[PDB]
Amino acid sequence: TLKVDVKTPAGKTDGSVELPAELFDVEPNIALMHQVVTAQLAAKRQGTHSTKTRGEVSGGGKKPYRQKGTGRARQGSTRAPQFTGGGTVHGPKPRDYSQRTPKKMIAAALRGALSDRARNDRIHAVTELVEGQTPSTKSAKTFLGTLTENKKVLVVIGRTDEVGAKSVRNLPGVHVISPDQLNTYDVLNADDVVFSVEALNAYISANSK
Amino acid sequence: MKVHKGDTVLVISGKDKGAKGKVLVAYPDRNKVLVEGVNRIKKHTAVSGGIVTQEAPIHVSNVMVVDSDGKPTRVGYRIDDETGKKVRIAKTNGKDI
RNA sequence: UCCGGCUCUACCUGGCUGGAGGGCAGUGAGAAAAUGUUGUGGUUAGCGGAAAUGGCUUGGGAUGGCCUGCCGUAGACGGUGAGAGCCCGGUACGUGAAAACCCGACGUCUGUCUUGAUGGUGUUCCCGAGUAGCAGCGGGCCCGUGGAAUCUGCUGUGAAUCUGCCGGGACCACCCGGUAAGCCUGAAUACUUCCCAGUGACCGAUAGCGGAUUAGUACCGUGAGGGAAUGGUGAAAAGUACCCCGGGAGGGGAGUGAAAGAGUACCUGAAACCGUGCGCUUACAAUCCGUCAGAGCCCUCGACGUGUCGUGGGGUGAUGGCGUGCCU
RNA sequence: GGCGUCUGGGGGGAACGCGGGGAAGUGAAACAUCUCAGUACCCGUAGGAAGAGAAAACAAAAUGUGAUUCCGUGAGUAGUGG
């Protein structure tokens, strides 16, 4: 197994948490994680890119002039693509880039990411980021400074820890997430991961059975 | 807009940094103010005067209102519920201005 | 549950109809309006909102760099004289509605039940008629008339009321299911002229709406209708006072500006195109216009020795050889 | 029919809806059936949604389901088709 020592904002130690090998000592698959984060960011991408074809452009209904006699090129609409002001032939249209990634692939990428972090000793666990009902970004900053000197941090906490979330929210290199929303992209963008104990055990109890 | 006509200010950004003056004019549509002794342009007129030196406006963000004791301040707003008047104050000393 | 009056008439006994306790619902499809009181319920204005005049340096200017601090439920986005969490609008967060409107809640109020239901026994009546069904012609169903059901329009014909009728893909029997020809019915669903807040591995002025600009304008057409082009000075107009040439335009000095190689013809300012100046070349020559060799001239870089030589580089090109554009 | 009075309508609106009417270019390497397509277009009508809707339904012998609508499948299948 691999043990993570729970910490406290007082620098104390509430105890320890076991990390299962099936979730934290799996071999990482770079190509898998690449595919998974690629799909993530593709789903993030909204295809809000559109253009007008020669049919959607205003006008261009009538032939500008006689087919023959003028010495001009043949035309059928002023909004044809070669025309300035004309339609876009093969241009962006709205499209959804969301890849239909398999669940096992997603989960395995997540586990590989967390396993890399655990092997390199970048997973920390804590009871709570700060004490009760007084969001203190000072306190959270100092605490995370004890836990890690890194810029990029992923804080995994329940949806009910509004106090800790808010306290650690405005920090620049911090990304807050819920364990039920854990993802390869955020875990890999993080240089360190910091669970709350309830959040960690929630991830454990969800991914065990 | 936290800086009014007649208010005394201190320029904090600009060529005239460190200079004080009365806000002679305020342009909220422009978020500018016109202060005595700063942003001194040399205007050409087609007249006696000729190259006459006058004051130009300046962005209100480049000025700070001065405290009672001669220190800059960001400007805050209490509420005088004893008269229902939202009044200005300094962030430094809390005194009205 | 109670009372009263009728219950043809008074008399005993069987139904109805008013009043009263109470339920049951309600502005709903299920009947309909009005009425108030009232919700830190909402929308339609907004307000507050922390933290650097920090030092040094560069700079026209600091929002740059280096170093100091500080806030952070606020490091979102913009602006400000150049990449600003701490200058500004603001943000997180929290507050705020007199009035109107919309959601509620409470009730007045309205309706209904309230003389009521309960559970049983055997015959007659009823259970949606020009309907169903049938035929003819058609439509549409996966089904293009096919063996063609179901559904459906028109025209004719035209029944049965429950042991009745319809459907179960011709049809018949059995069985099953259902109970047409009468009505209503929210939600899940589709859409966005318009309004608000936001986002973009969307365009960024020949793009993106036709329309960043006078835009459905100018303009064209009798008309329906068609349908453009036109963005950027600068940080701030500080938009060049004044003198000189000039009729003016335009310019030169001077000035502003950090910069006028930013002068309302203005950011950068390519090419085609047009010039001017310098070098070389060319007026006995037959030229896909160049290539290869190359005289001479000019320039340049090095060396030595002092101008000839080189591991040279370039521009020109006398002259000779070769040489029939690109695309389709 | 006339007179009077009262209540209402009339027209507009980008899209969506319901009911009706209903092409042709095209494709079939021709073309008429067929397709395009019940599209475009038109008409009449609305409502904020509409329509449909409470079985004269499905089903198949399962003690079956139990209004309607919509989505996905069933399935480009069964079938239909010069």
mmCIF file of C-alpha atoms (C1' of nucleotides) in Angstrom, chain B residues 2-4 7-8 64-79 86-97, chain C residues 48-53 87-88:
data_model
loop_
_atom_site.group_PDB
_atom_site.id
_atom_site.type_symbol
_atom_site.label_atom_id
_atom_site.label_comp_id
_atom_site.label_asym_id
_atom_site.label_seq_id
_atom_site.Cartn_x
_atom_site.Cartn_y
_atom_site.Cartn_z
ATOM 1 C CA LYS B 2 -15.508 60.107 -5.622
ATOM 2 C CA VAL B 3 -13.713 63.219 -6.934
ATOM 3 C CA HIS B 4 -15.648 66.475 -7.060
ATOM 4 C CA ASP B 7 -11.872 68.793 -3.888
ATOM 5 C CA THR B 8 -8.133 68.847 -3.372
ATOM 6 C CA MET B 64 -6.224 60.683 -5.145
ATOM 7 C CA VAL B 65 -8.213 62.876 -2.823
ATOM 8 C CA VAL B 66 -6.170 64.340 -0.012
ATOM 9 C CA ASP B 67 -6.911 63.710 3.640
ATOM 10 C CA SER B 68 -7.450 66.369 6.270
ATOM 11 C CA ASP B 69 -3.797 65.918 7.269
ATOM 12 C CA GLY B 70 -2.351 66.035 3.755
ATOM 13 C CA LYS B 71 -2.258 62.331 2.857
ATOM 14 C CA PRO B 72 -3.915 60.641 -0.133
ATOM 15 C CA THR B 73 -6.816 58.304 0.359
ATOM 16 C CA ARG B 74 -9.217 56.080 -1.386
ATOM 17 C CA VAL B 75 -12.691 57.435 -0.799
ATOM 18 C CA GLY B 76 -15.388 55.524 1.033
ATOM 19 C CA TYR B 77 -19.005 56.165 1.864
ATOM 20 C CA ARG B 78 -20.695 55.772 5.217
ATOM 21 C CA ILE B 79 -24.388 56.504 5.763
ATOM 22 C CA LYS B 86 -24.662 59.217 2.245
ATOM 23 C CA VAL B 87 -21.495 61.198 2.942
ATOM 24 C CA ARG B 88 -17.897 60.844 1.827
ATOM 25 C CA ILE B 89 -15.047 59.713 4.043
ATOM 26 C CA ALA B 90 -11.404 58.770 3.794
ATOM 27 C CA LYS B 91 -10.259 55.182 3.992
ATOM 28 C CA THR B 92 -7.267 56.262 6.088
ATOM 29 C CA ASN B 93 -8.726 58.260 8.980
ATOM 30 C CA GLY B 94 -12.449 57.747 8.371
ATOM 31 C CA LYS B 95 -13.020 61.497 8.515
ATOM 32 C CA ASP B 96 -15.372 63.283 6.155
ATOM 33 C CA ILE B 97 -14.045 64.933 3.027
ATOM 34 C "C1'" G C 48 -21.773 49.685 -0.330
ATOM 35 C "C1'" G C 49 -17.630 46.834 -1.059
ATOM 36 C "C1'" A C 50 -10.727 45.281 1.346
ATOM 37 C "C1'" A C 51 -5.700 46.160 0.066
ATOM 38 C "C1'" A C 52 0.670 50.489 -2.266
ATOM 39 C "C1'" U C 53 0.622 58.396 -3.409
ATOM 40 C "C1'" C C 87 -5.558 54.174 -9.282
ATOM 41 C "C1'" C C 88 -10.885 53.873 -11.453
#
